[PDB]
Amino acid sequence: QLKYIKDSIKTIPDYPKAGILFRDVTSLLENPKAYSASIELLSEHYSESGVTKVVGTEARGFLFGAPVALALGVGFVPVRKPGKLPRETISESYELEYGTDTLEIHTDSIQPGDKVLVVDDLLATGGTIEATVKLIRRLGGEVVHAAFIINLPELGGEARLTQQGIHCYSLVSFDGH
Amino acid sequence: QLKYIKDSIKTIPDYPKAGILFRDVTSLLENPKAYSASIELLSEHYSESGVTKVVGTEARGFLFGAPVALALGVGFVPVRKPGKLPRETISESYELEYGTDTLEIHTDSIQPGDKVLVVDDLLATGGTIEATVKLIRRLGGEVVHAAFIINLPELGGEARLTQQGIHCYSLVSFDGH
Numbered sequence: 001q002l003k004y005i006k007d008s009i010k011t012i013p014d015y016p017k018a019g020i021l022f023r024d025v026t027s028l029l030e031n032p033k034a035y036s037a038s039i040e041l042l043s044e045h046y047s048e049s050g051v052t053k054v055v056g057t058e059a060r061g062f063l064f065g066a067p068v069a070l071a072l073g074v075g076f077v078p079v080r081k082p083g084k085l086p087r088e089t090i091s092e093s094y095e096l097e098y099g100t101d102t103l104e105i106h107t108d109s110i111q112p113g114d115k116v117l118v119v120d121d122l123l124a125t126g127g128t129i130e131a132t133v134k135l136i137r138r139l140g141g142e143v144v145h146a147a148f149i150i151n152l153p154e155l156g157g158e159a160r161l162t163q164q165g166i167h168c169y170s171l172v173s174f175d176g177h
Numbered sequence: 178q179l180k181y182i183k184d185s186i187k188t189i190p191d192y193p194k195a196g197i198l199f200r201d202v203t204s205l206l207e208n209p210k211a212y213s214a215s216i217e218l219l220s221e222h223y224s225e226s227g228v229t230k231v232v233g234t235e236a237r238g239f240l241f242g243a244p245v246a247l248a249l250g251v252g253f254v255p256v257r258k259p260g261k262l263p264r265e266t267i268s269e270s271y272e273l274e275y276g277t278d279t280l281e282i283h284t285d286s287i288q289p290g291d292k293v294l295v296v297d298d299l300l301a302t303g304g305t306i307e308a309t310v311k312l313i314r315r316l317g318g319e320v321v322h323a324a325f326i327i328n329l330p331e332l333g334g335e336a337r338l339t340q341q342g343i344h345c346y347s348l349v350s351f352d353g354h
């Protein structure tokens with residue numbers, strides 16, 4: 001199963017620059033068996049967790065977070081780049097390689113007592129997830145779990161989230177930057 | 178049911194400019210009953226359709242297309258703004274209010290014989306959907322169905338898609354621009 005999921009992910013060499021082996025999750029998306037298995041494994045992993053909300057960042061986070069939310073029977077809450085959410089938001093900044101950006105969340109969608117799972121497609125540096133954790137906690141939400149399809153351990157994302165008290169669960173792992 | 182879905186959607190007046198009543202689908206997302214019902218109704222509507230792929234545009238399209246794909250047991254194929262898909266793409270342009278943009282799809286993810294359902298959150302002018310239809314058809318895919326949570330009939334999206342031979346199915350409809 002885990003092997004069938006991993007085999008369904010394609011690698012594109014020298015993209016987006018020479019030396020990087022791009023791990024392309026869209027090939028998993030188009031394989032119904034691998035996609036539904038991925039959602040099955042993520043959701044069952046947290047079935048006993050008392051999770052009350054799932055949060056995912058746009059856009060690829062939506063592809064894994066929302067189905068997990070549906071499978072758990074809990075609400076899904078999007079985290080978006082600025083100017084896309086219509087109600088009251090709070091905001092957190094994070095670093096890109098070449099500058100800064102921000103993420104927003106609806107202030108009403110998280111409240112004290114919420115047990116929140118964050119789901120994303122791939123864990124790289126972990127900067128967006130670290131900003132997302134801060135957003136949730138500022139609103140009185142509890143978050144100690146982040147789930148991914150792919151972990152790239154060499155980029156230090158997991159170590160960094162560990163520093164914030166986050167337990168990361170990933171289905172597969174790959175070498176490289 | 179349809180009423181419970183519709184009541185779960187919030188309206189924000191004078192956003193993003195005065196006079197517009199913004200219909201905010203994020204309130205549906207965070208209501209597990211309304212969200213799972215929405216996916217149930219969309220999927221059952223096409224259960225007998227012989228659909229073999231579902232396509233959704235980023236990002237809000239992902240939130241409805243991918244769960245429908247999972248429920249139908251078929252592959253999901255993303256349509257994205259340029260420079261996000263890693264494998265070979267084709268491209269189509271469309272008009273925004275203030276300029277032009279393009280959408281891309283993976284050339285390998287659609288092939289002759291595919292029966293394709295397009296799913297999005299809200300039907301407004303229909304420009305992105307019209308570009309998406311062209312992408313699918315260029316790759317030998319058959320598409321005659323588009324599904325939405327919300328239709329804003331006054332913006333002419335449905336009439337425009339009818340001209341391309343698309344049958345639109347929407348769960349709820351709202352007045353206004």
Ligand SMILES: Nc1ncnc2[nH]cnc12
Binds near residue numbers: 176
């Ligand atoms: N190798 C890789 N594949 C996909 N996404 C990435 N982000 C950073 N490195 C990556």
Ligand SMILES: Nc1ncnc2[nH]cnc12
Binds near residue numbers: 329353
């Ligand atoms: N009233 C409205 N609500 C949400 N999205 C829109 N796009 C165009 N008009 C809209």
Ligand code: NA
Binds near residue numbers: 110
């Ligand atoms: Na709140």
Ligand code: NA
Binds near residue numbers: 284285287288
């Ligand atoms: Na093709």
